[PDB]
Amino acid sequence: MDEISETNTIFKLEGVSVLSPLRKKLDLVFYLSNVDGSPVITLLKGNDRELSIYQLNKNIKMASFLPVPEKPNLIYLFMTYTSCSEPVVMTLNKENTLNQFKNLGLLDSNVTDFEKCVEYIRKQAILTGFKISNPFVNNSFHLQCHRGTKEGTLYFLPDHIIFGFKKPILLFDASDIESITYSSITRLTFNASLVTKDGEKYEFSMTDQTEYAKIDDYVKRKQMK
């Protein structure tokens, strides 16, 4: 059916490191389908299509750049879609991206700031009919905490909470959080438990106490509305 070419690709980022919904180095391609002339995002090894999303305006539900904690030379692009099914998580290497974009004549060309790469991709998101938030730019916040025995990072976006990235990744809409309640107050940490309107309950443990301030305001504001 579809053929990806130099003449129909909007842009291609080589060798991104995908975590989910599978762990493999792949290529990110935005292109206009020859089949019906509409935008398609796809991930490829060589020329095997590992994953494709279509009608981006309908099917990308949310997309965002999140920081890789402790690793500023990297960033995550995170996306939730119903393709034609877990979230997509990619790690892009900031300097390697800047390079690719330069060799592709997209950046001019001793520009150093990776944020320009981000801006470009976000602009493509727009032409291509969806959007990507970028809420952590140098407020939203994240923190390390545990789910059961395994560490993870919990992200407070403006309209979502993401806990990842070991299986399963979890995504919540602020709308669906009925309440957050605080338990297990030790001398150093405390615990937070979310309950989804749809009954379900999640427990995040060893949140360091210096985080409470933030997590409160967030839950204050989100409930005052």
Q: Whole-angstrom Cα distance, residue 203 to residue 200?
A: 11
| DSSP structure class, residue 175 | G
Residue 145 corresponds to which amino acid? C
Specify the resolution in Å. 3.1
Q: Technique behind this structure? A: X-ray
Cβ-Cβ contacts under 8 Å for 208 (sequence gap 6 or more) = 143, 144, 188, 189
According to CATH, the topology of domain 2-138 is PH-domain like (2.30.29)
HSE-CB of 53 using CA atoms within 13 angstroms: 26
Which of 145, 11, 155 shows the shortest CA–CA distance to 75? 155
The residue type of 97 is T
Q: What is the CATH number of domain 139-225?
A: 2.30.29.30
Question: Could you tell me where in the chain the CATH 2.30.29.120 domains are found?
Answer: 2-138
The residues of the chain that CATH labels 2.30.29.30 are: 139-225
